[PDB]
Ligand binder design. Structure first.
Ligand SMILES: NC(=O)c1ccc[n+]([C@@H]2O[C@H](COP(=O)([O-])OP(=O)(O)OC[C@H]3O[C@@H](n4cnc5c(N)ncnc54)[C@H](O)[C@@H]3O)[C@@H](O)[C@H]2O)c1
Length: 267
């Protein structure tokens, strides 16, 4: 298998539609041995982890908790065994309070809310790398999830600002990881109907926010030369696994687009 013998930590499972659930599933089917992390609802997440192809341990990680981060490497080592190291780390973590995602105008998001979203969505990519690089093997790989923020998307407002910060953080993490023999890259996915996003397109932040995301989704499918399936994150999961493998060993600090090609076309 593509990831035979690799030990990979995967953050970000909260539902069975989470991108991270599919990353974990595909990675296990490709031979990887996993450690999962979960935020807050650990019993809920454990029952989802129980549905993965193979048994894998779940440990707690709130990326806003300094003690969780400062103990993370030790707690991972407790699961994989002293002397064993990680080959891969997946950041699949995002959050922005509703005030920053269209329930009110762009200008009405208070900084306390924006700062919380940037903490979880962007700064924590550096936090996670800081915590785990000391227990990573040369040849290893850190991968984070991106949503192309090169143009303003009124569908996502301050989450797009957070992704712009994340892309910058990724390039600096590549610099830190390099001397360890470790790569850092982002996978920019098209829109996926995770439970949170299905709620927004469904109307939970109001009619206008629902229509804005729906228009974004519709344009995406029109632009993508190979199509885009918002109800199936498997192609995104495979792309993450490609970057976790040994097959892109000279790629670091970059963004790989798993978006059906929609970012490359203008209609
Ligand atoms: N859904 C999409 O359309 C889409 C598209 C491109 C990229 N992405 C990105 O993919 C990543 C995964 O999101 P998703 O779409 O699978 O949604 P999701 O809601 O299933 O996953 C987001 C995860 O972030 C976790 N999280 C939030 N606060 C946290 C904290 N304090 N500590 C640790 N974890 C925390 C949640 O518990 C959840 O597991 C995010 O970075 C998201 O921005 C999503």
């Amino acid at each position: 298998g593509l990831l035979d013998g690799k030990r990979i930590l995967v953050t970000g499972i909260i539902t069975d539609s989470s991108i991270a659930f599919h990353i974990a599933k595909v990675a296990q089917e490709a031979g990887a041995q996993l450690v999962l992390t979960g935020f807050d609802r650990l019993r809920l997440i454990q029952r989802i982890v129980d549905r993965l192809p193979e048994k894998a341990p779940l440990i707690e990680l709130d990326v806003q908790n300094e003690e969780h981060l400062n103990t993370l490497a030790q707690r991972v080592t407790a699961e994989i065994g002293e002397g064993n190291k990680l080959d891969g780390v997946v950041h699949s973590i995002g959050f922005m309070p509703q005030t920053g995602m269209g329930i009110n105008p762009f200008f009405d998001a208070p900084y306390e809310d924006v700062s919380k979203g940037i903490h979880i969505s962007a700064y924590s990519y550096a936090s996670l790398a800081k915590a785990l690089l000391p227990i990573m093997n040369p040849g290893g790989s850190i991968v984070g999830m991106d949503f192309d923020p090169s143009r303003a998307m009124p569908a996502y407002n301050w989450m797009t600002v957070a992704k712009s910060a994340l892309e910058s953080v990724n390039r600096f993490v590549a610099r830190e990881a390099g001397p360890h023999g470790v790569r850092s890259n982002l996978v920019a996915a098209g829109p996926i109907r995770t439970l949170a996003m299905a709620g927004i397109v469904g109307g939970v932040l109001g009619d206008q926010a629902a229509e804005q995301i729906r228009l974004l989704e519709e344009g995406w499918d029109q632009r993508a030369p190979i199509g885009w399936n918002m109800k199936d994150p498997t192609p995104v999961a495979k792309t993450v696994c490609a970057l976790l493998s040994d097959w892109l060993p000279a790629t670091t600090g970059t963004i790989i687009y798993a978006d059906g090609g929609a970012s490359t076309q203008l209609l």
